[PDB]
């Protein structure tokens, strides 16, 4: 009697439900797990706050307009002010984690539009200027707000080119990364489970973003006649298997 469409995800003291899912992607066919001794370098003991950080945090909502270009969030950056997770993220020299990303967008059997929801490991952004100019720290560290692609470009910030994935590659090939679609006629949500992917066992959570969640309208939003021309897009994210180390005084970052 059960369906691939109705699902529940319980993580800590938060439970999410969807009645219009389209399965879910488990990046590179790998589920998150803690760091093993064989892989460990750092001799320190890791802190595992569990259910206090491994729960769902909901980001500030977005508004899908018929002219929308897309949005980009960088992790662990987007969750740096989220309760005890953000705290831990700034008291330790190193951390490690995976996530459960849940993107939401409900509509009407009269609407049509399609979103591409993708997770890109190491999304090194291109600068507005080009040349040898780098994208300033604060521009890749927007926090919860993320990068709104239809915002005017500034000096030292990224390009606002969805067509070029903000990195010099083409949009259509973004399908090589773990992704999922939100096709209104079908979908309601998109869920992606992300394991820890990095060339080092553990890392600094502030000077390096391991991934950037990208939500990009492909098929323009087309609402029924007399209906409101927009739809909100909500992103809920839960850290899973989080570990922290190198505890000390509060990390000091720019701003």
């Amino acid at each position: 009697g059960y369906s691939d469409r109705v699902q529940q995800i319980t993580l800590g003291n938060s439970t999410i439900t969807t009645q219009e899912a389209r399965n879910a992607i488990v990046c590179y066919a790998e589920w998150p797990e803690y760091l093993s001794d064989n892989d460990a370098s750092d001799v320190n003991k890791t802190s595992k706050p569990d259910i206090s950080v491994c729960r769902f945090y909901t980001l500030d909502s977005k508004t899908w307009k018929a002219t929308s270009k897309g949005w980009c969030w960088k992790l662990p950056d987007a969750l740096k002010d989220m309760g005890v997770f953000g705290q831990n993220m700034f008291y330790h020299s190193l951390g490690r984690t995976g996530y459960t990303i849940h993107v939401q967008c409900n509509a009407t059997k009269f609407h049509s539009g399609c979103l591409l929801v993708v997770v890109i490991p190491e999304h090194q952004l291109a600068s507005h200027e080009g040349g040898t100019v780098s994208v300033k720290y604060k521009y890749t560290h927007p926090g919860d707000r993320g990068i709104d692609l239809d915002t005017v470009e500034v000096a030292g910030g990224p390009t606002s080119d969805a067509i070029y994935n903000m990195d010099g590659t083409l949009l259509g090939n973004l399908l090589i990364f773990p992704h999922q679609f939100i096709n209104m006629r079908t979908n309601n949500t998109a869920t992606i489970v992300v394991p820890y992917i990095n060339s080092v066992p553990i890392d600094s959570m502030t000077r390096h973003n391991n991934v950037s969640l990208m939500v990009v309208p492909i098929a323009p939003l087309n609402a029924p006649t007399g209906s409101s021309p927009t739809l909100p897009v909500t992103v809920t994210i839960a850290p899973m298997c989080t570990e922290f180390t190198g505890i000390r005084s509060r990390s000091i970052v720019p701003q």
Partner: protein, 236 residues
């Protein structure tokens, strides 16, 4: 003092040979490998993944609308799109398959084309996808088209239709670079019935098309691409 005779080619540097050489850092210990998800062993592994085809090639500048195939309501018997099957050129050149195919000289195998419907849930349609083997001209109408490999698509819950383009060829390998003798035929789309939209709905609906290779696929004779070049060496 073992007598030898050196052969032609002695001292040449063939970029493609594979021999032993002394290590400049003797006794050096490389960092231990750690587990990293997403290991790629063969390129044939990744071309099996479908990526979008910029079929709406119309325009002057690249734009997200190149990936959107327009569909019109209450049109009957009409043609939706057409294209040659040159995977190293045209609409397929920028795709992941065409991108990797261009690093090789020969190709062989079956292709996978999926068409995903994005129109309202309360709409309906029946489309016809066709593959015309080499030997003739691209179909000029649905009647001509349906005489070849085709799939009738009924739009519904199942959002995507998948059609495989079976290896239809005399010679066992075709060139990736567009060559007449080794052409793969045509691909076209038409309305079997027509798109029907519900009340309070209007405008165009779009189709998303994906391309990937079947397990059938093979690519040989590695070479340099035409998809990247430079006039000067880069610097920091």
């Amino acid at each position: 003092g073992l007598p030898t005779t050196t052969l032609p080619g002695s001292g040449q540097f063939l970029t493609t040979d594979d021999r032993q050489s002394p290590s400049a850092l003797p006794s050096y210990e490389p960092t231990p490998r750690i587990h990293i998800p997403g290991k790629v062993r063969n390129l044939l592994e990744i071309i099996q993944v479908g990526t979008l085809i910029p079929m709406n090639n119309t325009g002057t500048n690249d734009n997200v609308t190149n990936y959107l195939i327009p569909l019109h309501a209450d049109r009957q018997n009409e043609q939706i799109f057409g294209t040659k099957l040159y995977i190293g050129d045209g609409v397929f050149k920028t795709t992941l398959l065409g991108e990797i195919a261009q690093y090789y000289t020969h190709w062989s195998g079956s292709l996978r084309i999926s068409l995903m419907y994005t129109g309202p849930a309360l709409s309906s349609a029946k489309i016809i996808l066709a593959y015309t083997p080499p030997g003739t001209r691209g179909p000029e109408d649905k009647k001509e088209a349906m005489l070849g490999t085709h799939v009738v698509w009924d739009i519904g819950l199942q959002s995507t239709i998948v059609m495989t383009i079976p290896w239809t060829s005399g010679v066992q390998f075709r060139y990736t670079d567009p060559d007449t003798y080794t052409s793969a035929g045509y691909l076209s789309c038409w309305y079997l019935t027509s798109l029907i939209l519900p009340p309070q709905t209007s405008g165009q609906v779009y189709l998303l098309s994906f391309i990937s290779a079947c397990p059938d696929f093979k690519l040989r004779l590695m070479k340099d691409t035409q998809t990247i070049s430079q006039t000067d060496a880069l610097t920091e």
